[PDB]
């Protein structure tokens, strides 16, 4: 049977033929893969067959060559490379012959060519392919279908290869693409294909784009496809004009003036969505780049050096043309709309915010007449645009000249938060929240403070799109009032602030807002919970009985949720359930951090029982395990030495938190809990530590866990050394050998993503050495004789700190910890350290570099270390 009829049966709507034909096609692919590929190439290359059979034939080739999973893609390319070169040449010949042999415009042959080339361009087994594609494009003898399919094949290729291989062949495919993108081609499909191809073929064209006469031609040819009547060509040309601005800043001085400005402005004023969107996005990218350049221009000027790259100030020069368009675009809003739908009106606000943070104090005289004339206007789009345009400009300029505007703008916004239209109410709530966030003392001012609280408490009950915006305003207002009172109230904690007369009922309305049935819309439940955490954390000493009430209510809810787990049936049930448990655990943490100890003793047993039950019954899912461990850590920290009554029931869960190394965040939380646990319990951690050290050494032994877990284990070894003291000698030799092996490791300098890890591990090793020295030293007025078990290692430690002292690139925590270790070694032993420290000068360099640094703990620890060293040296 011919395979053409099998493909035609596979397209057919009846599954009784479809499943049998599909299984025959699969058995043909299994029985002999290259013969099946050869026969499908013979089917594809024939102009006489039906187009449906040819496309169905090409589908199998496209599926065989490429896939979305990368390891499957790798072994698919490997199984292509295992076939004999003559049969591969046969299918290469037929697939390359197929281009131009189809009258339809979507074609499978271009993607077949792309998959074939992606499988074997890194091994140079097809040299003819690039000259054939370039020759097909460059030939003046017509055939528009062939030219379109070749340009689409080049564009398909340029997005799938690793760019380091196409850097060899970047001179010829650019010639083909720019030949195809020129203005004299009559077919607009060819122009569209070449314009979509150049957007991919851009990252590895750096040597072409660096040469002046080539980049002039590329910019001139891209600047012609923005004037095409096809509009898809217009969108595709603006879309890579944006990318050229993003990647090749500091080349754009020649073109930005007498070309790109007019193109982008005229694109902004269009009445088509996808054409105005790119004109907005171009200037948004300009505002990103010109802020990064200013950051580096300040950073290099602090050290007195000129910066690497200077800025050109395009966005500051384009303000008076950009702002009257950006304000006007904000009114283009529909009477019914969706929240997640990106549109030009939604883009103009983000561009205005970025323009505000970039240009700073100069943006306000261009925006302020718009708000002034459209705050009072009987049309909801212009009023909503005025409120949004007022709320965008807050983060930019100087607050000292920005607060008199909002002082007299507050009574308008108080009225405007009770508008007939929902959209104006939502925008008014957002601007009030930004007023609380950025200019906090202008909101605390008691002329408008009580009506503002009345408006927010009323607006907590409204539509779900505006209650969520109200909640963040509450969260900001609590911190503003707490910090304003904390300046006044002396030493510890404020006794009475602005919101203590109204803390009750605010807390009650938040507890009502939590239990809404429509809480799944617009993050309502989670935003109410975050507001509740932020209000409980920043409470005064006056508000404590309300905190008692909230603690009772929260523990009641937490006891309810533990019975709810069996009523779960679907995936969305688990998705909402895990969010509810995470929010309850974080709220319990913020409650436990605030309650007094005499009241914290009373809730502790039911808190640990509920945390233990939610650790047991839940089938992993990661996040609840992390949150349970962190909640237990804060409970340990607040309870102190009284925690040990719960220890023996907690020990197997601590063990299984350490033993399970599949997820690294739960074991990171476990080792942080081990550090907090030993730091709290001090000398009583003796009978539990053997399993802990064995599990930590086993976790050090494995070679496929994540790299970030490894720095923490050495630090908690230092912590358990400090907690134990004299009984650490049975682990001392083992941990010293592991510290030697850890310090003897090194890694390459070429990437900062490895240099940062090297610095982190160095800090961890130094902390472990300080921990073991201070643990063996004892707490008495004279040093214990057990420190002399470390005395062969002092030359090794001094060579290690000499080795890190020899490096030229340091995180400041490295020298800050090293100075403390030098001070510990000065206090640890007698005068014998002097003839070792006199031989290495870079530690004496480091003990001055620590004091001249700006980070304070390095200065203090280096001063203490050099004081001990000078005291030792003067006692000759």
């Amino acid at each position: 049977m011919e395979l053409i009829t099998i493909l035609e049966k596979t397209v057919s709507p009846d599954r009784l033929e479809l499943e049998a034909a599909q299984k025959f096609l699969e058995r043909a692919a299994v029985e002999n893969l290259p013969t099946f590929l050869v026969e499908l190439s013979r089917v594809l290359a024939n102009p006489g067959n039906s187009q449906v059979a040819r496309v169905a034939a090409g589908l199998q080739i496209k599926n065989s060559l490429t896939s979305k999973d990368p390891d499957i893609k790798a072994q698919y390319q490997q199984r292509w490379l295992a076939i004999d070169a003559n049969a591969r040449r046969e299918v290469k010949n037929y697939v390359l012959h197929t281009l131009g042999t189809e009258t339809y415009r979507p074609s499978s042959a271009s993607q077949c060519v792309a998959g074939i080339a992606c499988a074997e361009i890194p091994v140079n087994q097809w040299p003819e392919l690039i000259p054939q594609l370039v020759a097909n494009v460059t030939n003046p003898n017509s055939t528009e279908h062939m030219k379109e399919s070749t340009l689409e094949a080049i564009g398909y290729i340029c997005q799938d290869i690793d760019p380091e291989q196409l850097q060899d062949k970047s001179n010829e495919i650019l010639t083909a693409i720019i030949q195809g993108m020129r203005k004299e081609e009559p077919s607009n499909n060819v122009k569209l294909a070449a314009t979509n191809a150049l957007l991919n073929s851009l990252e590895f064209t750096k040597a072409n784009f660096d040469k002046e006469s080539e980049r002039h031609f590329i910019m001139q040819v891209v600047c012609e496809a923005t004037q095409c009547p096809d509009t898809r060509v217009r969108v595709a040309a603006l879309q890579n004009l944006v990318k050229i601005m993003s990647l090749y800043y500091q080349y754009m001085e020649t073109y930005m003036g007498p070309a790109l400005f007019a193109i982008t402005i005229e694109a902004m004023k269009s009445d088509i969505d996808e054409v105005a969107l790119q004109g907005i996005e171009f200037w948004s990218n300009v505002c990103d780049e010109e802020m990064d350049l200013a950051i580096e221009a300040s950073e290099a000027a602090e050290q007195g050096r000129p910066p690497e790259h200077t800025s050109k100030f395009y966005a500051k020069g384009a303000l008076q043309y950009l702002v009257p368009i950006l304000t006007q675009t904000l009114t283009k809003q529909d009477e019914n709309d969706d929240d997640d739908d990106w549109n030009p009106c939604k883009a103009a606000g983000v561009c205005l915010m970025l323009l505000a943070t970039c240009c700073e104090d100069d943006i306000v005289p261009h925006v302020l007449p718009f708000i002034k004339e459209h705050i009072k206007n009987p049309d909801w789009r212009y009023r909503d645009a005025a409120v949004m345009a007022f709320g965008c400009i807050l983060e930019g300029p100087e607050p000292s000249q920005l607060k008199p505007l909002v002082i007299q703008a507050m009574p308008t916004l108080i009225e405007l938060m009770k508008d007939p239209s929902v959209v104006v109410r939502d925008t008014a709530a957002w601007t009030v929240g930004r007023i609380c966030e950025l200019l906090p003392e202008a909101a605390i001012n008691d002329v408008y403070l009580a009506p503002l609280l009345q408006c927010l408490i009323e607006g907590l009950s409204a539509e779900p799109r505006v209650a969520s915006n109200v909640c963040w305003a509450f969260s900001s207002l609590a911190e503003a009032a707490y910090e304003a009172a904390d300046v006044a109230d002396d030493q510890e904690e404020p006794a009475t602030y602005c919101l203590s007369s109204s803390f009750e009922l605010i807390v009650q309305k938040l507890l009502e807002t939590t239990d809404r049935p429509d809480g799944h819309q617009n993050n309502l439940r989670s935003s109410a919970y975050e507001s509740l955490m932020e209000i409980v954390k920043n409470s005064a000493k006056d508000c404590y009985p309300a905190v008692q009430k909230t603690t009772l209510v929260i523990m009641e809810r937490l006891q309810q949720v533990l019975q709810m787990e069996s009523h779960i049936q679907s995936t969305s049930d688990r998705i909402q359930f895990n969010d509810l448990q995470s929010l309850l655990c974080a709220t319990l943490q913020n409650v436990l951090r605030k309650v007094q100890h005499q009241d914290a003793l009373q809730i502790s047993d039911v808190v640990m029982a509920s945390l233990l039950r939610m650790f047991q019954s839940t089938a992993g899912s990661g996040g609840v395990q992390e949150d349970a461990l962190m909640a237990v850590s804060t409970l340990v920290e607040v309870l102190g030495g009284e925690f040990l009554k719960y220890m023996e029931a907690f020990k197997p869960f601590l063990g299984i938190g350490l033993k399970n190394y599949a997820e690294y965040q739960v074991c990171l939380a476990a080792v942080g809990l081990v550090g907090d646990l030993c730091r709290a319990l001090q000398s009583n951690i003796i009978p539990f530590c053997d399993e802990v050290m064995q599990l930590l050494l086993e976790n050090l032994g494995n070679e496929n866990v994540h790299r970030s877990v490894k720095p923490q284990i050495l630090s908690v070894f230092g912590d358990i050394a400090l907690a134990i003291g004299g009984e650490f000698k049975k682990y001392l030799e083992v941990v010293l050998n592991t510290l030697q092996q850890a310090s003897q490791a090194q890694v390459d300098k070429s990437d900062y993503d490895m240099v940062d890890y090297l610095n982190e591990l160095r800090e961890s090793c130094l902390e472990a050495y300080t921990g073991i020295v201070q643990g063996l030293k004892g707490d008495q007025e004279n040093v214990h004789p057990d420190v002399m078990l470390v005395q062969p290692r002092v030359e090794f430690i001094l060579s290690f700190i000499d080795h890190i002292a020899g490096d030229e690139d340091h995180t400041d925590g490295v020298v800050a910890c090293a100075a403390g270790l030098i001070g510990d070694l000065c206090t640890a032993f007698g005068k014998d350290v002097l003839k070792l420290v006199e031989a290495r000068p870079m530690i004496h360099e480091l003990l001055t570099e620590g004091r001249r640094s700006k980070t304070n703990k390095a200065k203090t620890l280096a001063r203490w270390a050099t004081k001990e060293l000078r005291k030792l040296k003067n006692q000759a």
Binding site: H216, M219, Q220, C223, E224, T254, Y255, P258, A259
Partner: peptide, 4 residues
């Protein structure tokens, strides 16, 4: 030169 550049001649758009």
């Amino acid at each position: 030169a550049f001649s758009f």
